[PDB]
Amino acid sequence: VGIRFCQECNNMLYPKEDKENRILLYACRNCDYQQEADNSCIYVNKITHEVDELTQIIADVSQDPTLPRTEDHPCQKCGHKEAVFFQSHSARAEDAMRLYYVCTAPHCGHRWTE
Amino acid sequence: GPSSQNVTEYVVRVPKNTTKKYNIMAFNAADKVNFATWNQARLERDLSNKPEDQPWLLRVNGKSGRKFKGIKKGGVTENTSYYIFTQCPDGAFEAFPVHNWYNFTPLARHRTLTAEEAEEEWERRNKVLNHFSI
Amino acid sequence: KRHIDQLKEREYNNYSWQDLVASGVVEYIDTLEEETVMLAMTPDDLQEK
Amino acid sequence: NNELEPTPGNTLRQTFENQVNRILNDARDKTGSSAQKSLSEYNNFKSMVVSGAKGSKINISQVIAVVGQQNVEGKRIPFGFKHRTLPHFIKDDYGP
Ligand SMILES: [Zn+2]
Ligand SMILES: [Zn+2]
Secondary structure, three states: OOOOOOOOOOEEEEEEEOOOOOEHHHHHHHOHHHHHHEOOOOOOOOOOOOOOOOOOOOHHHHOOOOOOOOOOOOOOOOOOOOOOEEEEOOOOOOOOOOOEEEEOOOOOEEEEOO | OOHHHHHOOEEEEEOOOOOOEEEEEEOOOHHOOOHHHHHEEEEEEOOOOOOOOEEEEEEOOOOOOEEEEEEEEEOOOOOOOOEEEEEEEOOEEEEEEEOOEEEEEEEEOOOOOOOOHHHHHHHHHHHHHHHOOO | OOOOOOOHHHHOOOOHHHHHHOOOOOOOOOHHHHHHOOOOOOOHHHEEE | OOOOOOOOOHHHHHHHHHHHHHHHHHHHHHHHHHHHOOOEEEEEEEEHHHHHOOOHHHHHHHHHHOOOOOOOOOOOOOOOOOOOOOOOOOOOOOOO
């Protein structure tokens, strides 16, 4: 799923097929450096696009003076009783009125939806 | 250790003259070049530009050896001069001015794709994908 | 309040707008910078806990 | 809390905001009816509205009861700032 760079000329390693041992070989076009593939899959295309933005929001958003705050929902990892919540603010806005939270305690940065 | 409790004081001089101009030769750490493997080197100004401005051409080991191209930095003394500080047998320090900064990079002596030929190849390949469709 | 009772005296005190900016109580705010700010419209009504 | 269910052919925002708009319209209609409910026979607005000379029955309610709900481009006031309408609100405020 990732990418492979050549170890000699630092370029993009293409996948190739050899008719001897039935194993995927990654080859270079400039040089002909070789090696075998460990996962033996090339292409993947996610159309659902249901990526949870809990992996994209940053912990320093709790320094924003223009975001609402809450005393109801406390943090689990530290027990702080003050959070700051917001919406998806991104694409995939068909049914996007969820409410992600971020703890505001210094050096906690814990994030969670509900 | 002496790096922790080490103490000393040495004199510094800045001679108004030198027998040779001093330059910096910089290498990417990521290459981790073994200088011991350099049995010999040749060093000449680059010929693409056909002097003091010329980029350097470094050829390691005389005949059979490595090759790098050195490209001059934009500035070296535009705001602050750079000095080479060297230790002398008397313990005193000697400072040497840096004349220039050259950037040295590794070279790929493999593969030669050709212009007009490459473009012609691309169109045929592009054409081939369009042909025999549905 | 120390800034007001000495600002109503500019006629014979030589204390004016310039001595007010240089003391860090007001500040010019551009339009771009105005997107990273949180404004209150009125002190006595929006800054109460 | 994700307890809304979209209707056929309606996004959640649609379904969301059009339900909010329907509630706002019902409230405005009730306020207008209340404003109309209280006039006298000697009133001079009712005297120009009834005879049809000048005016309409909504100007009475706008003068007496409620101006109502504004909207540009046929939809609610947009977010001209980023996630706000003015620097006097907190972000993503959807109230009336
Ligand atoms: Zn390669
Ligand atoms: Zn926390």
